[PDB]
Design a protein around this ligand. Structure first.
Ligand SMILES: *[C@@H]1O[C@H](CO)[C@@H](O[C@@H]2O[C@H](CO)[C@@H](O[C@@H]3O[C@H](CO)[C@@H](O)[C@H](O[C@H]4O[C@H](CO)[C@@H](O)[C@H](O)[C@@H]4O)[C@@H]3O)[C@H](O)[C@H]2NC(C)=O)[C@H](O)[C@H]1NC(C)=O
Ligand SMILES: *[C@@H]1O[C@H](CO)[C@@H](O[C@@H]2O[C@H](CO)[C@@H](O[C@@H]3O[C@H](CO)[C@@H](O)[C@H](O[C@H]4O[C@H](CO)[C@@H](O)[C@H](O)[C@@H]4O)[C@@H]3O)[C@H](O)[C@H]2NC(C)=O)[C@H](O)[C@H]1NC(C)=O
Ligand SMILES: CSCC[C@H](NC(=O)N[C@@H](CCCCNC(=O)c1ccc(I)cc1)C(=O)O)C(=O)O
Ligand SMILES: CSCC[C@H](NC(=O)N[C@@H](CCCCNC(=O)c1ccc(I)cc1)C(=O)O)C(=O)O
Ligand SMILES: *[C@@H]1O[C@H](CO)[C@@H](O[C@@H]2O[C@H](CO)[C@@H](O)[C@H](O)[C@H]2NC(C)=O)[C@H](O)[C@H]1NC(C)=O
Ligand SMILES: *[C@@H]1O[C@H](CO)[C@@H](O[C@@H]2O[C@H](CO)[C@@H](O)[C@H](O)[C@H]2NC(C)=O)[C@H](O)[C@H]1NC(C)=O
Ligand SMILES: *[C@@H]1O[C@H](CO)[C@@H](O[C@@H]2O[C@H](CO)[C@@H](O)[C@H](O)[C@H]2NC(C)=O)[C@H](O)[C@H]1NC(C)=O
Ligand SMILES: *[C@@H]1O[C@H](CO)[C@@H](O[C@@H]2O[C@H](CO)[C@@H](O)[C@H](O)[C@H]2NC(C)=O)[C@H](O)[C@H]1NC(C)=O
Ligand SMILES: *[C@@H]1O[C@H](CO)[C@@H](O[C@@H]2O[C@H](CO)[C@@H](O)[C@H](O)[C@H]2NC(C)=O)[C@H](O)[C@H]1NC(C)=O
Ligand SMILES: *[C@@H]1O[C@H](CO)[C@@H](O[C@@H]2O[C@H](CO)[C@@H](O)[C@H](O)[C@H]2NC(C)=O)[C@H](O)[C@H]1NC(C)=O
Ligand SMILES: *[C@@H]1O[C@H](CO)[C@@H](O)[C@H](O)[C@H]1NC(C)=O
Ligand SMILES: *[C@@H]1O[C@H](CO)[C@@H](O)[C@H](O)[C@H]1NC(C)=O
Ligand SMILES: *[C@@H]1O[C@H](CO)[C@@H](O)[C@H](O)[C@H]1NC(C)=O
Ligand SMILES: *[C@@H]1O[C@H](CO)[C@@H](O)[C@H](O)[C@H]1NC(C)=O
Ligand SMILES: *[C@@H]1O[C@H](CO)[C@@H](O)[C@H](O)[C@H]1NC(C)=O
Ligand SMILES: *[C@@H]1O[C@H](CO)[C@@H](O)[C@H](O)[C@H]1NC(C)=O
Ligand SMILES: [Ca+2]
Ligand SMILES: [Ca+2]
Ligand SMILES: [Cl-]
Ligand SMILES: [Cl-]
Ligand SMILES: [Zn+2]
Ligand SMILES: [Zn+2]
Ligand SMILES: [Zn+2]
Ligand SMILES: [Zn+2]
Lengths: 694, 694
């Protein structure tokens, strides 16, 4: 038989291992020849595997690279202008790779050029609340200063945005061992920790969903009109560069001015973590000088798009996508994901060669330039938005399959909660001590829901990966799943070797997953989800799960507002409409579920499948969120303080944030009321898509 | 049998006559009790007629009314401040209606209040080219002047916008007998011409598709947040008032300054049509003073929405809609249309009572507040946009059925051209001399296509009626049809009694259509279109007709650009991408048509019906046109110079308009190139929705 068990049984850990080795021997940086060659290899192999069509979709997008003959570095400079200490020009390469060429040195992609010189201020994680503490409580002014911030907690582009608005003239990002060195584990190559010379690459854009900075709204095809660089979307205005903790120690050790305000500001280095500005007495005349010479360049990128045509509903698309470009070798990010996608394609293709096809069309994507701002997925979605609008059932992302070996991590739309619970109850746990137990059992034990007993945690979607355009712009039901660590406070910081040269095949094979059993489990989860979405007669979405969360989110946003009772009285701020809409959605969803269970009629079925498919779509507002036109989902958006985190009722949340500091409370509370109206209307309008159609 | 002939045969001229009489005995001004009572009557009757459900959908929108105890008028004032001539406070009511109460006096809806006093400048029709002539050629400055303009040629809101930007401090609109008095016909009540005391009411908003000025984007429901009046959309900034030609003569007769520049500036009154500014020598010290005291008021409006549920595809909607609110009695506008809709509902209901249902759902709408800016249709579409997006097959409008007795007039999407041709070939011509001939034959003879021999003229859609939100915002295939006059130069001016108290039942019964045969023909066209759209197994849309027009429109926009060859050389302005996209659309449409003719499989059928339905949808750009976010169709928009006219490739057209006057030609030609890219992309993306789906 050709059922899900047949699909799942065909997946093999040893194939995932072979693919991971094959994809990680040389760097695959976006825009480079190496990565184009890998695209062509994947295209050829997906064809061999049995897909109906496999094409490359190319775009010409703005990328950023260091200047090979004018390298980036930071100095401490004396009053005579002598550079007395310099940060490293490259990470010491790992054993056996010291002769690999074209390893891009650490840099912050899209930094502007400059050579700012100044006094340092230390800003902890450079979060919104860290700058509030500095400027409001400690009365420290960052204007004209170079800020030094530790990586962790929030997306680095948010740090840079925050520093820019505080008036900084430059930002130095570093990896503190508090966040990137687990106690009792050795540094690479002897363990999975970051060494003092390791550095985390990554872009510092704030694109808010736009994709290529030069072509917002439209694909960057051959005839595209491009914005001038001065009008580009999302580019930082001050130079930025990342460094390792050996170099950070040298910059932080001489810091003077004010003591850290409390222990949450101190990392694990042997320095005081003084906030500054500037250095202690003896070194008061020394400064820090940055030298950044990176260039932004329009560069061709290539997505591979494979199609497995549906037997019954070929005009309904289930998409499994993940990226292929990496900063260096991509041992975890992304090739641990890409190897899983490759084995999933091979398995579906095996069934296809035996005469099977899925009910609905499955599209498989190998995206390019994810590391430079989700560029490949977003340009392709811009090109194909009308097809995706009207035909897109679901998107499952497939970046890194592992970031630890402890338990499952899942973020997805509520419409997928029941699917994930049911699938994980049918899969074997790979965990020590849970032999013979379901993955649902191990996951629920290790990562309990904060809300419900005997349920696992599933988080909201924000941004930070290639599902963003599908979910936040287009309103296609999306999900993601991987294996993770037990390090809760580090959930947005990345594993220690994230975006470093040290993330290699050997890292994964020696220290993360020697038997590739966690990779196999992730392949079963991602592939099983795609299988069910593409083959179930009724789409496997439960609208009642959205009703449950909407009440949760309404209670939460009401509780934030209720911190300001006198203003709610003064400005007549009522959440009554939003609770009414949620109540209506709950009632209508319950009645729809009854009809769905109670309805031989393929028109009623498809009518009902269309209601299920367009339900996520109903939460899209074609006017977008305030000043973020490409974030259009009214229930979820990436947090304005941390792109990696999802925020619920984002338009209301942002209207309320720090509202006590707004100079015109009438205007500010008016906009809260406006956002309550938009949210109440949108929830009611989504509910009504589930009513009887006539 | 229950087929289209059965539906068409059930329609009766004598019923349309009875309904028209019933709907025109008292005024039905939007927001008044009279119009709410008519809504309730229609709701009850549509229920009686057999519809499955009939509901009222109400909204609270900004309307505008004169002040009953502080009337609007214009004076000529002497230097001592004595008002020596006053315009009328009301139109002399027609015979037998001199005791009807609540006839709203002539006013321009949404005029601000004020009492500006100044010198007159005469501006012909106040078109963009009339102001170019005044300011650029004649060197006459309208700043601080009161402008007097004749109605005709373009939407009055465009006149007001133009006058405002020329610096006018007020606008007086009047009906010149050149445009509103056909030679050799008597004035009402003895014929269909406008008497010297008649006045055309009408709104002067420039909403650009927004609907209620206080709630753009969202329905004006009970909990809506409203903009403050200072932020309202589309309100004029200077007072405006309309007058009849007896009063105009008194204002124009003393005009001095410059002679009219040529004969196209002279109307038919016995005055010189001097442009001014101000009066001739003896009267040079007299001024004109306006007194406008109208108020804008949020007021409840009511749409009636009737549903006839489809037997096979109940989640596909064919909509027949037209408005019910009138300025006064609405003899032609709108009740000649509403009477036709009423008889169409009665006929469909007769079939329903015999056991028939249409294949797809038919929705019938009686819209409110069309006269105040398409408010009822637009608020309802805003409320239901997600259902309409995903389920809307077509919208057929049904305002005035007659504006003459000469031949048919049709404006519709190219997707409906073949449907209209085929239907009209099967209907009887009602015209004298064409007894026994088809309507297609008479129509083609009287209104030949400028492009093709043996074809009739069908025009583009712009705005001016309730189809606007469905077509220009949502991208639902739309059409309209009525009987018209033989007066080509008057095609946007309105029939002589347009929006006057004199448009009564007697006007229609005596002078337009005594046998109600033209009304019956229009009912057969509108109803036949709805019947075919709701019942044909394959949707009756021909994508190849869009391919033909797209080439026409591309040739036309290229030819406009080619008036500037040196700039096209300098700025490398190429239309190659747009012609490539049109060529691709033509090829793909041809192949789709082959499959459609060549494909027992209801999934392939519906898949193909969905491709047909979403084809109009593909021309929508979710970012809208420049500074007009609610006009989203890339091929058509209402002309920026005349809301009644449709413009093709509007984004390119507006980028090119008057480009030789732009101060920064680099920037201006850059934006032309941007608009070519958007249009080429959009045409290619629409073409690709017709490709094989996988
Ligand atoms: C959740 O679904 C429910 C339906 O079960 C839906 O209920 C609707 O609520 C609206 C708003 O309360 C009701 O609107 C009323 O409609 C009547 C006519 O039916 C009007 O007369 C009312 O207006 C009068 O009263 C107002 C309030 O005092 C005054 O402001 C106004 O000036 C008038 O005096 C009012 O518009 C509507 O009837 C019901 N529909 C039902 C029960 O079928 C509710 O809106 C849904 N929630 C959301 C957020 O959409
Ligand atoms: C109408 O449909 C046709 C398909 O029948 C479609 O043709 C496509 O045209 C584009 C643009 O010309 C082609 O893009 C090329 O793709 C190749 C790889 O396939 C690239 O190597 C090309 O780039 C090189 O050449 C460029 C031009 O000199 C340089 O600017 C560039 O730097 C490179 O040197 C180029 O991107 C595409 O291959 C075809 N696809 C086909 C034939 O299948 C056409 O685009 C459609 N029209 C519209 C408006 O969409
Ligand atoms: C906007 S352009 C982004 C470009 C690039 N993207 C990433 O590197 N993404 C990594 C981030 C890893 C650290 C944060 N972890 C989470 O956010 C997280 C949430 C849920 C689940 I299930 C798994 C992981 C990733 O998603 O794996 C960048 O950020 O530089
Ligand atoms: C933006 S709010 C509009 C509110 C209101 N609308 C109308 O009165 N509409 C009348 C206009 C009649 C004169 C112009 N004729 C055409 O445009 C025309 C084109 C094609 C065909 I087939 C038939 C007629 C109408 O459509 O009948 C207004 O204009 O004050
Ligand atoms: C990754 O695997 C691919 C596929 O097996 C290898 O590419 C093949 O290499 C052989 C020998 O050079 C050629 O004959 C084939 O044409 C290639 N097939 C393709 C590209 O589809 C590639 O060598 C492997 N890479 C590494 C680093 O081991
Ligand atoms: C840090 O790097 C800089 C740049 O290479 C070094 O400064 C240069 O030193 C050379 C040789 O002494 C001079 O000829 C250059 O003019 C210097 N350039 C600049 C910009 O100062 C510096 O010596 C290095 N510092 C340390 C401690 O290694
Ligand atoms: C997850 O599994 C549950 C348990 O089998 C499914 O819920 C059952 O669905 C069937 C078919 O509609 C009903 O007859 C049962 O009453 C349901 N049992 C319940 C709710 O306890 C559920 O549909 C599955 N979720 C999916 C497929 O998304
Ligand atoms: C228009 O026609 C309607 C429907 O026949 C008339 O309304 C009816 O009037 C009678 C007598 O007053 C009542 O018994 C019914 O209840 C009404 N029916 C409705 C409202 O559905 C109305 O009188 C006619 N109007 C004019 C001006 O002739
Ligand atoms: C035009 O109308 C105005 C306003 O009613 C008339 O002016 C008024 O005349 C009365 C009686 O003589 C005075 O008491 C008012 O003070 C006047 N009002 C204003 C604003 O001037 C005027 O007489 C009318 N002119 C003509 C020619 O009929
Ligand atoms: C308008 O009528 C024509 C003439 O009957 C229809 O075109 C025919 O359609 C049938 C069915 O697909 C084909 O077999 C013929 O070859 C067509 N004849 C032609 C093109 O000359 C046309 O489809 C009708 N238009 C509609 C229904 O929108
Ligand atoms: C990189 O730096 C070199 C050496 O100074 C310079 O010649 C070249 O212009 C730079 N390349 C760029 C800016 O792309
Ligand atoms: C910070 O410093 C600059 C002076 O260089 C000043 O313009 C700015 O207002 C200061 N901000 C605060 C909060 O002191
Ligand atoms: C794998 O799990 C073991 C046992 O709990 C742990 O000691 C090891 O550190 C884990 N590896 C990683 C990379 O987390
Ligand atoms: C209308 O005019 C009267 C009489 O001057 C005045 O009392 C009232 O305020 C006005 N009504 C309005 C502005 O709605
Ligand atoms: C028109 O008149 C005013 C002076 O009242 C002036 O400000 C404006 O620039 C003038 N425009 C032209 C074109 O003369
Ligand atoms: C109706 O047609 C006749 C004959 O052509 C014409 O004389 C008459 O004016 C028409 N009526 C109207 C209102 O156009
Ligand atoms: Ca783009
Ligand atoms: Ca509105
Ligand atoms: Cl992922
Ligand atoms: Cl109409
Ligand atoms: Zn990644
Ligand atoms: Zn990454
Ligand atoms: Zn009308
Ligand atoms: Zn009208």
């Amino acid at each position: 038989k050709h059922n899900m068990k047949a699909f799942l049984d065909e997946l093999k850990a040893e194939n995932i291992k072979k693919f991971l080795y094959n994809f990680t021997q040389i760097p695959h940086l976006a825009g480079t020849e190496q990565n184009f060659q890998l695209a062509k290899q994947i295209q050829s192999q997906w064809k061999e595997f049995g897909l109906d069509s496999v094409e490359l979709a190319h775009y010409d997008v703005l990328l950023s690279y260091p200047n090979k003959t004018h390298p980036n570095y930071i100095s401490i400079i004396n009053e005579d202008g002598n550079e007395i200490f310099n940060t490293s020009l490259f990470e010491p390469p790992p054993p056996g790779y010291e002769n690999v060429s074209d390893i891009v040195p650490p840099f912050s992609a899209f930094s502007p050029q400059g050579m700012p010189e100044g006094d340092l201020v230390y800003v902890n994680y450079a979060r919104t609340e860290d700058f509030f503490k500095l400027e409001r409580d400690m009365k420290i002014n960052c204007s004209g200063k170079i800020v030094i911030a530790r990586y962790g907690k929030v997306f680095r582009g948010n740090k840079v945005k925050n520093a820019q608005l505080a008036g900084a003239k430059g930002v130095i990002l570093y990896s503190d061992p508090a966040d990137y060195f687990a106690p009792g584990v050795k540094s690479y190559p002897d363990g999975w920790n970051l060494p003092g010379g390791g550095v985390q690459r990554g872009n510092i854009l704030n694109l808010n969903g736009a994709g290529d900075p030069l072509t917002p709204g439209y694909p960057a095809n051959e005839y595209a009109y491009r914005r001038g660089i001065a009008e580009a979307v999302g580019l930082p205005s001050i130079p930025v560069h990342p460094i390792g903790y050996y170099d950070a120690q040298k910059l932080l050790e001489k810091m003077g001015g004010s003591a850290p305000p409390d222990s949450s500001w101190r990392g694990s280095l042997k320095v005081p973590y003084n906030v500054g500005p500037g250095f202690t007495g003896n070194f008061s005349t020394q400064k820090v000088k940055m030298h950044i010479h990176s260039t932004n360049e329009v560069t061709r990128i290539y997505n591979v798009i494979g199609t497995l045509r549906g037997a019954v509903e070929p005009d309904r698309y289930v998409i499994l996508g993940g990226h292929r470009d990496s900063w260096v070798f991509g041992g975890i990010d992304p090739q641990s994901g890409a190897a899983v996608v490759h084995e999933i394609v091979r398995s579906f293709g095996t069934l296809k060669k035996e005469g099977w096809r899925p009910r609905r069309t499955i599209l498989f994507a190998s995206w390019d330039a994810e590391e430079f701002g989700l560029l490949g997925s977003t340009e392709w979605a811009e090109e194909n938005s009308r097809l995706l609008q009207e035909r897109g059932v679901a998107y499952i992302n497939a970046d890194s399959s592992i970031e630890g070996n402890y338990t499952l991590r899942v973020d997805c739309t509520p419409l997928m909660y029941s699917l994930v619970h049911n699938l994980t109850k049918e899969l074997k746990s790979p965990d020590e001590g849970f032999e013979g137990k379901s993955l649902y059992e191990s996951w629920t034990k290790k990562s309990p829901s904060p809300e419900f007993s005997g349920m696992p945690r599933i988080s909201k979607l924000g941004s930070g990966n290639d599902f963003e355009v599908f979910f936040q712009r287009l309103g296609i039901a999306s999900g993601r799943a991987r294996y993770t660590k037990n390090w809760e406070t580090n959930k947005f910081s990345g594993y220690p070797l994230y975006h470093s040269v040290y993330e290699t095949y050997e890292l994964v094979e020696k220290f993360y997953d020697p038997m590739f059993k966690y990779h196999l489990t992730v392949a079963q989860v991602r592939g099983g989800m795609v299988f069910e979405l593409a083959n179930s007669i009724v789409l496997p979405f439960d609208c009642r799960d959205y009703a449950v969360v909407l009440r949760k989110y309404a209670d939460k946003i009401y509780s934030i507002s209720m911190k300001h009772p006198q203003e709610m009285k003064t400005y007549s701020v009522s959440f009554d409409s939003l609770f009414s809409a949620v109540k209506n959605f709950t009632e209508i969803a319950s009645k729809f579920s009854e009809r769905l269970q109670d309805f031989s009629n393929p028109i009623v079925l498809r009518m009902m499948n269309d209601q299920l498919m367009f339900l996520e779509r109903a939460f899209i507002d074609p006017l977008g969120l305030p000043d973020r036109p490409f974030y259009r989902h009214v229930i979820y958006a990436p947090s304005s303080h941390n792109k990696y985190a999802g925020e619920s009722f984002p338009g209301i949340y942002d209207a309320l944030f720090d509202i006590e500091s707004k100079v015109d409370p009438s205007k500010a509370w008016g906009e809260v009321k406006r956002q309550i109206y938009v949210a109440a209307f949108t929830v009611q309008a989504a509910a009504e898509t589930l009513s009887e159609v006539a």
